[PDB]
Each structure stands twice: as C-alpha cells, then as structure tokens.
Design a protein around this ligand. Structure first.
Ligand SMILES: [Mg+2]
Lengths: 85, 244, 394, 240
C-alpha cells in the first residue's frame, strides 16, 4: 500500500497504489507428517522450497519472521513434536 | 470406410444436396476428414445457408475445410448472435470469404466501434455488415474518419448513410468529389441549425453515378479541370498528412 | 430443472474448519476451556448432546421408518377433509356401488299420506328457518358456521315431535363426536376410511332391506365406470405408517349399535373452504359405506363374501340451504374384484330448502321491495327429510 | 436492512402462496429498479415448467387431463390446473384448452415426425418442421424459459444431426438439441397486447409507479453524443 506519481513524474498528481501477489493453489506432501496439504502459495514460496530441498526442510529451516504464516508455524510445531517424540 | 461413405451420402441427401452436387463437394475436399466434412456442412446449413450457395463458397475457398470444428461452432454462434442469419450470410460470405478465417477480436471492436463510437443502432449495424461486407478488412482509424467526414462535413444522418451504402466507397474518391462541389459552390455544409441555403445534391448522384455523368450533371465542368483539381487535392492531403 | 427455495433463504454453510486440525499429532488450542467465544482461538468441535430424560415440552419424535406401526405398503385414507376430484364418479368406483336416481319408494311412501304430516308443517319449517338465519343472535347477519348446524338441529327436533303418533321413535338417539373406521381393498389397494364430524343418529333396530334379491342380483350386469388419466386414489391421504383396524366407534354392549342416519354439515364461512356439491355427495357415500362396512365386519366376520342380510345406512348432507339425501345399502364384502354383485345407493341431488334469505329489508327509491324472510321456500325438501327420518320407525 | 426473500418454499404445491412485494428495492434497502411499487395484493401459484415430469413410481410417456383453465395475476398468460395419475400441478395454457381436454406428454423420439396436437409436449426432433412451438428449453431437463408470454409463438426451422434451430419471437435464431422438450401451439391470451388500460388508476393497480418528471435531455444526449475528430472539429457547428 503506497503512492505512485503519475507517468513517473514528480510534478504530476499522486495516486494511491495497491500491489498484490499472484496466488496459486498447489498440492504438497509432507514426509514427516505423512499427509498431503492443499495450501495457496506464491511463486516465491515454490522457489524457497526448491532451494531448501523439500517442504519439510523449508518449514523447519525458515524462521517465523520469513514464513509470515500461522499455518506454516503450526506445520513447524507438528514437525518438531514428531521429531521430539 | 464404406459405411462412413454411405452415411454421409444419406445425410447429404436428407439435407438437400443433389447427386450432381454431392460429388463436387468430394472433388473440392483435399484430404479433409469425412466426419470433419460432415459437420462443417452441418454448421453451414444450421447457420441458414442453402445447399447450392454452400457448394459455391467452399469451392472458391477450399481452405475452410481444414479448420477445427470447435472454432466453427463458436464463430457460427457469434454470427447468429449479432443478427446475421439466413439469406444475409450469402452476401457477407461471398464478398468476404475470409470472414471465418479471421479472429473474433477484430470483428468485436469493429461493431463496438460502430455501435458505441459511431453511435449506430443494432439494426443499422447488421444492415451495414450485410450491405457492405468490406468494412471488416480495413482498420478502425480510417473507417471512423470516413464516418465522421460524412456526419459533419456532409451533414447526413444515420438512416441516410445506412441506406445509401456510403461506407463501401473509397475515402479518396469521396474526398475528391465532395471537396470539388464545395469549392464549386454546388455543395454547402449544413450549419448548426441544420439549414442549407441551397438544395444539397442527393448522395445518390454524387457517388453511385460515374464521374462522366457526375461532372455533367452536378459539377457542370470540363473533364480536364477535374483532373487538374485531383492532382491539386492529392498534393494538399500529403502535405497535410506530413504536417500532422 | 428449477429447484424450489432460493439459496439466500437456505441454511448457511458452517465456516470451514481451522487448518490446525489437519496437522497430525497436534492438540488444538480452543476457547472451549473458557466457555465463551473469542476470535483469536481455534473453534472447538462439540460431540452430539442428548438430553437424557424425557420432557413433553421439548420432545423429539424418532424417525418415521423406526415407528412401530410402519408398513412398506402404503394405505390411502379418506377423512372428513378429503375432497375427491371426480366426486361421485370416483366415489362409486371406490365403494363398488351402483347409483340409482331418486329415493326408494318405500321411504317416500311414508310421507304421501297426510296422516304422517306434521300439523302446521309449512309454518313450523318457515319459523325454524327464520330463527336460524335471522333471530339466532344479536348480530343481524349470522355467519354460515353459526346457522348451518342449528338449522339441522331444529329440523331434527321438529321431526322428533312425531313420537305422539309413532311411539317407535323413542328407540333412537343422536350421537355427537362419534368416529368410525373401516378398512378394505380395491384391486390390490389398501383403502381405509375414518369418518368424523356431524351427528350420528343411532337406533336399537337395524334398518329394513330396501332392495330385493332379484334387484341385488341385477348388479352383476352393471359395470363400474372408469377414468383413465386420473387414478382412483387421487386426493387421498397416502401414509406409510398406519394401523389396519375396523371399528364402529362404540364398545360392545352399546344400546344403539345400528347407525340410522349420518348428518354432515358444510359449515364453512369461505366458499373455497366449502366442499362442492359433487364432492359433498361423495363424502356421504364414503362415510355411509364405511359405517356399513364396519357393521358388516363386526357382525358377519372378516371374511370377504356376499352378505345374506344387507346393511342399510342413510345419510343427509347440507350447507344451510341446499340439501342432499342418500340411502346406502351394502350387499357384499368382497370388494377386491370389480365383477359380481355390487352395492346400491339412492341419491337426491341439490334439494333447495329456500332459494335465498333476506335478513334486511330491501329499499329501492324509498319503497320496500323484498321483505325480510325466505325466498322461494320449497316444502318438498322437508318432505324428503321427514321421509328419511321416519323410515323404518314408522 | 433485514430483508428476507419470500421465495423460500421448497416443496411444490398447487395452493396459492402468499408473497410480498419488493418495491424496486434490493436486499440492502436501496432502490435498484424504479417505477415499481404498490398494486393489488397477489398470491403466487407455482408453475411446473418441466412438462415431462413422470411420477416417482412411473416412467415414460403419460396421458394427462385438464381440470380448469383460469387467470394468473402474476403473468399475462393463463394458467391451467392439470391433473394426472395421483397428482395435480399448474402449467401454461395454449390458445384452445378447456376443461375436459386430455393432453399427452412424451419424451420418446420417433423415426418419423408425429402429428402435433395443440398443448401436447414432444421432443423437438419428433415434431414436423414449421410447427408453432412455445415453452422451449436450452438443454434437456432444464425447463421452459423462453416463449412464455401470452400469445408468443416460436417456429421450428430445421433439424441437423441432433441439433434443431428454433425461431424466437424476437426474430432471432437459437441452437438446441432434439432431446429438448417443447409444447405445440402458441400461448393463450392472444388479444392481451391490444388491451387498453383506460386510465392512470389502472396502471397503479398493476403495481407501476409513474415515471420521473425530470427532463432527461442530458441522459438522452449522453447516449447519443459523439466526439469530433481534430480535422472535423472545425465543422461541428457552423454559425448561421
Ligand atoms: Mg417528462
């Protein structure tokens, strides 16, 4: 949420602008949880999963300030509990 | 294979095709699937075309056979939706055989241009398409300029231009004849009130008639003067276009 | 095609469950502990709750198919509120009866002689009509629900005033709020009749047979009329939960077991609520057949056969001014097959006691035109009413 | 706004249904359509537009008998109470349907076209070409949606390989399959369009509020205003 100058000119009018991410629904399988989850994600999330080499690795490695998802943190707690127990 | 051949011959017989007719569709077909030939004629007659007009158009343009059936149904539905159906299809198809080959978008914005930008009624647009199939090929810019040229400089309303088939005539030829009359004093642009101090010559004798009689009746001048004016007029237009 | 009930008025889908439940091996944190809702906590799921004790003010019935009296074979029930679509024609087919126009000669013969006539009969009937429709209550135009029952009651009381001449009239009484049930079959169709309403005139002696053996045996040649596009069980209450039972409505030992006359009233203020004359006549036939069938099964057993002694039941129906008279005689109990001996029924249709009644004077240009009172009173209607009442007893 | 639609009934019946007027307002309480309000109170009679609706225990074509043809306050056409088997339902009556008439409904498709009688329901493929047809449906089992007004009549033009072309009263073609069902003939109340209202009071009875008194010259001109081109801008208004 922010402002944009029309035609990229400082002397033109200032207009409100809203930028929204592109959302896709995909199917993900968790090795630790032995379950398949249908969760809406973005292209950035898929890239992060690929670099982390697995959804479980991506969930367990990424901190909470970068996950930005309560569902993702709940996935981490369930994975950690299974590993702990 | 044989049973397929018997079925299509039977279907053509029920659909109104003679034995002389049926065999010459076969000659026109060049490798097209028999079932793809069976339903392409089905959509054409479903549209409303009579048997012998169909045999004409496809034999002039055999490339219509090598077309997906799905797009044929979408195009056929679109043609019926816009008010084009039985009888009117023959005129638009013969003068513009490439109607089924072009995309839906260039037709979409053309009628949108006519209905919204040119402010034509739904019935008038259908009459324009039927009477003048050549409006589809050229771009929107010169058609809008042609329409507004008649509306403002000639002062003629919508029912007159849809009845006289003014749009089908060349922009260059109408400019030469109208400007010459206006400079001759024979034509006067209607004022804001719509009142002309002199009787405006009817659009029919300006354009529909040949230049020899047009010069003799309305212009009342020698042929070589018009030719000199034509070169003069063409000079100003290319200067005006270069300036703009 | 087009389904009834818009989506907006339909029950709303409960909101989706929280994704914490999808996580295996995780215990959700809900607001069920604090016993109140908060938005920042998971929504708990609640196991189904059962009261555990019976409460009549909050009782819930079990499912229909779990009821003890549940049968796969549907039974079509005719009750007081049923209105047959084909009227008498449908009624004849259901009852397997032959219709005869006009009352029996023996019933009518009891009135032709002037001895049985009531003294000042015309004057007494007119005063009864006037009191019912004009002198009944404080208001000036009594409604149909008010005078329709009282006009029949006063007619019965007027007819009951003949005990002086005929002491046998002391063996009959009028029974109110009496119900009866009867069950039978018609071409592999389970049919039941549950009569209600009106007044039941009961007597200690069964009515004499009206038709002879030769006349009864003449019903074999007669055939039942049929209607193809409409099923005979149309406009009938079809229910899969019921009980097959035949009842006369009275326990064994009742002093007046034989029904004499059934009186039916169309006491409805609104014309749409009022039954049509054809539908009203069909109601009498079905009720009379049910009363006759219940008596036949009670006396002659549950077997389906031709009765050696027929059962005669009379019926009178009216809506206040238009009267219908029916005499029903039941001859057989084997109604499964349409061929063979059939029962009989004599009917009189649309007998008007009076064409119209003026509760207020009609003033036209300050001139009285129609005085208060009945218009076109027909004394022949009461003669048939008197004949039906005096039948058997006289 | 606590607005609840009255069309909440879920089971079909022939009993008239009490209904409440909207007055041109949507569920938010704001006016969406102008000129609607008041009028005589009306009771809704549910109409079965699916002519071929066999009973639960039966199947296939069935005969059907007309009981009474009366006037529907909620539509221009006249409705007919028709009874068959052990049920009754409301349908739309054609030009000539009276009490005692028997009408057939059939989904059977024939090798040859069957003779079309008025009021009967037959598939589009089982009807002769050129018959008067009302109460058509887009797809099989959808139900009648088109040609429902009083006196309207469509005509079947051709059938080509399982698809039939019908002519709507608006002089526009439409593509449907032969498996769709339709009613033979034209709707009743042919003289409906020639009725004269007589006075402004009658229009208020029907539930129509008067038009706005504003002079909508701007609205008329806005829908008929054109933008001159830069070369033509000098010719838009020549002073007299
Ligand atoms: Mg005005």
């Amino acid at each position: 949420l922010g402002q944009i100058y029309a035609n990229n000119d400082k002397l033109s009018k200032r207009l409100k602008k809203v930028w929204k991410p592109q959302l896709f629904e995909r199917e993900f399988y968790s090795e630790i949880l032995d379950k398949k989850f249908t969760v809406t994600v973005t292209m950035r999330t898929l890239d992060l999963i690929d670099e982390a080499y697995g959804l479980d690795f991506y969930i367990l490695k990424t901190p909470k300030e970068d996950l930005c998802s309560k569902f993702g943190m709940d996935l981490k707690r369930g994975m950690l509990l299974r590993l702990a127990r | 294979g044989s049973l397929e051949l018997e079925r299509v011959m039977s279907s053509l017989l029920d659909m109104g095709f003679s034995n002389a007719h049926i065999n010459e569709l076969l000659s026109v077909r060049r490798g097209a699937s028999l079932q793809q030939l069976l339903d392409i004629i089905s959509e054409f007659i479903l549209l409303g075309l009579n048997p012998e007009p169909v045999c004409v158009v496809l034999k002039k343009s055999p490339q219509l056979l090598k077309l997906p059936i799905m797009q044929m149904r979408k195009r056929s539905s679109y043609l019926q939706k816009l008010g084009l159906g039985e009888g009117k299809l023959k005129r638009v198809l013969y003068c513009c055989p490439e109607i089924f080959t072009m995309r839906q978008q260039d037709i979409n914005d053309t009628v949108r241009l006519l209905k919204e930008k040119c402010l034509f009624t739904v019935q008038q647009v259908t009459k324009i398409l039927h009477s003048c199939p050549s409006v589809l090929r050229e771009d929107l810019g010169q058609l809008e300029y042609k329409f507004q040229y008649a509306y403002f400089r000639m002062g003629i309303k919508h029912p007159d231009i849809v009845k006289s088939e003014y749009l089908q005539y060349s922009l260059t030829k109408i400019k030469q004849r109208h400007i010459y009359l206006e400079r001759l004093g024979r034509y006067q642009t209607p004022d804001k009130k719509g009142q002309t101090q002199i009787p405006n010559p009817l659009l029919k004798d300006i354009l529909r008639v040949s230049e020899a009689e047009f010069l003799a009746r309305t212009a009342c001048t020698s042929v070589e003067e018009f030719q000199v004016f034509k070169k003069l007029l063409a000079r100003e237009e290319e200067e005006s276009e270069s300036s703009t | 095609a087009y389904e009834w009930g818009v989506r907006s008025t339909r029950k709303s889908e409960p909101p989706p469950l929280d994704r914490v439940y999808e996580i295996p091996g995780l215990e959700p944190i809900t607001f069920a502990g604090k016993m109140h809702f908060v938005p920042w906590l998971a929504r708990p799921i609640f196991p189904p709750w059962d009261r555990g004790y019976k409460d009549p003010r909050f009782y819930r019935s079990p499912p229909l198919h779990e009821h003890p009296l549940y049968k796969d074979q549907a039974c079509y029930i005719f009750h007081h509120r049923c209105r047959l679509l084909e009227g008498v024609k449908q009624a004849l087919w259901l009852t397997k009866t032959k219709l005869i126009e006009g009352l029996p000669e023996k019933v009518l013969s009891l009135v032709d002689d002037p001895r049985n006539h009531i003294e000042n009969q015309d004057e007494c009937v007119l005063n009864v009509i006037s009191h019912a429709r004009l002198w009944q209550t404080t208001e000036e135009i009594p409604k149909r629900e008010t005078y329709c029952p009282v006009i029949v009651d006063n007619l019965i009381q007027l007819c009951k005033s003949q005990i002086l001449k005929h002491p046998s009239l002391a063996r009959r009484i009028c029974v109110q709020n009496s119900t009866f049930s009867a069950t039978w079959n018609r071409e592999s169709l389970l049919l039941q009749v549950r009569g209600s309403g009106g007044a039941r005139l009961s007597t200690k002696d069964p009515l004499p047979t009206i038709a002879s053996r030769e006349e009864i045996e003449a019903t074999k040649n007669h055939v039942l009329e049929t209607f193809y596009p409409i099923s005979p069980i149309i406009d009938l209450h079809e229910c899969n939960i019921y009980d097959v039972k035949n009842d006369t409505g009275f326990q064994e030992g009742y002093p007046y077991p034989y029904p004499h006359t059934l009186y039916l009233l169309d006491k409805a203020n609104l014309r749409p609520h009022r039954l049509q004359p054809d539908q009203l006549r069909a109601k009498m036939i079905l009720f009379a057949f049910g009363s006759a069938l219940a008596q036949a099964r009670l006396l002659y057993g549950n077997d389906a056969k031709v009765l050696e002694q027929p059962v005669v039941v009379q019926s009178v129906g009216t809506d206040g001014r238009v009267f219908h008279f029916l005499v029903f005689q039941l001859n057989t109990t084997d109604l499964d097959c349409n061929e063979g001996v059939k029962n009989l029924a004599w009917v009189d249709s649309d007998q008007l006691l009076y064409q119209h009644f003026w509760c207020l004077p009609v003033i036209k240009k300050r001139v009285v035109v129609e005085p208060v009172g009945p218009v076109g009173f027909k004394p022949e209607t009461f003669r048939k009413f008197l004949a039906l009442y005096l039948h058997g007893a006289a | 706004a606590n607005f609840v639609s009255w069309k909440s009934r879920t089971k079909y019946t022939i009993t008239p249904v009490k209904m409440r007027k909207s007055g041109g307002r949507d569920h938010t309480g704001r006016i969406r359509v102008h000129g609607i309000g008041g009028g005589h109170k009306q009771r809704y009679r549910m109409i079965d537009f699916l002519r071929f609706r066999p009973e639960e225990t039966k199947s296939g074509p069935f005969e059907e008998k007309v009981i009474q043809v009366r006037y529907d306050p909620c539509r221009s056409a006249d409705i007919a109470l028709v009874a068959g088997g052990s049920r009754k339902r409301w349908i739309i009556a054609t030009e000539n349907m009276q009490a005692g008439d028997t009408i057939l409904n059939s989904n059977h498709i024939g090798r040859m076209a069957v003779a079309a009688r008025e009021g009967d329901a037959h598939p589009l493929g089982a009807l002769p070409v050129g018959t008067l047809i009302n109460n058509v449906e887009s797809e099989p089992g959808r139900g009648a949606q088109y040609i429902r007004a009083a006196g309207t009549c469509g005509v079947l033009l051709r059938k080509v390989n399982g698809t039939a072309i019908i002519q709507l009263p608006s002089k526009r073609q439409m593509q449907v399959l032969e498996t769709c069902v339709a009613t033979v003939g034209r709707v009743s109340n042919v003289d409906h369009n020639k009725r004269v209202i007589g006075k402004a009071g009658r229009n208020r009875w029907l539930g129509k509020r008067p038009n706005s008194g504003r002079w909508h010259r701007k609205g008329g001109w806005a829908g008929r205003k054109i933008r001159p081109l830069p070369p033509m801008k000098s010719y838009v208004k020549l002073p007299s």
